[PDB]
Amino acid sequence: ILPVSMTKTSVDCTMYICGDSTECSNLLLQYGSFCTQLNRALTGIAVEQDKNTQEVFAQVKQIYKTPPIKDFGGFNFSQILPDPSKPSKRSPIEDLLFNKVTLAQKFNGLTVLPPLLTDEMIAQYTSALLAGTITSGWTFGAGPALQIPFPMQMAYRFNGIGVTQNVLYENQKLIANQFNSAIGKIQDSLSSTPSALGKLQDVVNQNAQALNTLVKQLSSNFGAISSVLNDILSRLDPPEAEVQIDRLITGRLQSLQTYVTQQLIRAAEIRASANLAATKMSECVLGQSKRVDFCGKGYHLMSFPQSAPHGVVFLH
């Protein structure tokens, strides 16, 4: 399981700090251009998040489909292909993954922008990848897609790890049964472990905690007589209230800067895994890997991608 992107957030200085106060807005204008660069950094993070998901899934310019009649030499593949019975057109494993991880408010000039690729598009991309790698081998990642019967492709993949062709053909039923049993047990193993998918909930919880901490800072005196601008203005002379206002401005600006810096660091660390999921897709999924312990543990044969709330799941 690998996370590829996080949520996008946009923060407005005027609404967060001032709160539609003319005196605050005029007084805040003397600090220069801190907020322009804050907004620029947040927008850069959002655009990077939009780019992250495109380099992992959008690797095929064409949308393949499996034939209506499915006879792959005894291999099942029913647990990974999209289910026409379900109205969302998602595989049972994808449905379990989406049910297992579940996730709102909008105040003080904080907004969340929707992603460009809706989850239906991600599911369609992964379905195209699966239907291309099942009925065409690895040839669809280099040039045009060329068909080949699945047992022959498996015999090809057995030669890669140094085992002759005849091992598969004289043991075809046993291998098919073993693969079907492993695919069946995968669902039970994933569903019965409450911490299997903890690599994404960690990201969700971290982002939620950061956003919650930022809002909580709006109720701090920082040395002023009150945390509400209206109460400060009404119970003091506005000509001589500039000290309290300036103290509040300084505190809120420092909080905003801290939040933006930590978001930049978090995005920098998320991109390092978004760049690894793409490499794993390209090498394990579109071909066969001779590198040790890259795709699984043992001798690699093939991999199948599955989507997740904000990540991707590989079945090696």
Nearest to residue 2, comparing CAs of 59, 61, 51, 53?
53
CB of 194 to another protein, least distance (A): 34
| Token digits of residue 104 | 């709102």
Q: Which of residues 40-99 bind another protein (CB under 8 A)?
A: 41, 59-67, 71, 73
Cβ-Cβ contacts under 8 Å for 281 (sequence gap 6 or more): 56, 57, 59, 129, 305, 312
Task: Spell out, one character per residue from 290 to 309, where the chain touches another protein: x when CB under 8 A holds, - when not.
Answer: xx------------------
Cβ atoms of 189 and 313 closer than 8 Å: no
What residue 78 binds from ligand NAG, another protein, none (CB within 5 to 8 A, per partner kind)?
ligand NAG
Residue 282 binds another protein (CB under 8 A): yes
Q: Which stretch binds another protein (CB under 8 A): 27-35, 88-96, 100-108, 201-209?
A: 27-35
Can you tell me the distance from the alpha carbon of 214 to that of 102, in angstroms, rounded to the nearest whole number?
23
Helices 172-191 and 92-100: crossing angle, nearest 10°? 20
Partner from ligand NAG, another protein, none binding residue 264, C-beta < 5-8 Å depending on class: another protein
16 SS3 class: helix
Number of residues that bind another protein (CB under 8 A): 59
Closest CA to 50 of 118, 101, 125, 103: 118
List contacts with ligand NAG (CB under 6 A): 70, 76-78
How many CB atoms sit inside 10 A of residue 126's CB? 24
- Is position 172 an interface residue for another protein (rule: CB under 8 A)? yes
Radius of gyration of the chain (CA): 26
Q: Which is nearer to ligand NAG, 177 or 213 (CB)?
A: 177
Closest contact distance (angstroms) between CB of 181 and ligand NAG is 11
State the minimum distance, in angstroms, from the CB of residue 66 to ligand NAG: 10
**Residue 251's closest CA among 211, 210, 214?**
214
Specify the residue, 122 or 302, whose C-beta has the smaller distance to ligand NAG: 302
- Identify which of residues 231 and 242 has a Cβ nearer to another protein in the complex: 242
Q: Does 161 bind another protein (CB under 8 A)?
A: no
**What, of another protein, ligand NAG, none, does residue 121 touch, CB below 5 to 8 Å by kind?**
another protein
Residues 240-279 that bind another protein (CB under 8 A): 242, 246, 257, 261, 264-265, 268, 272
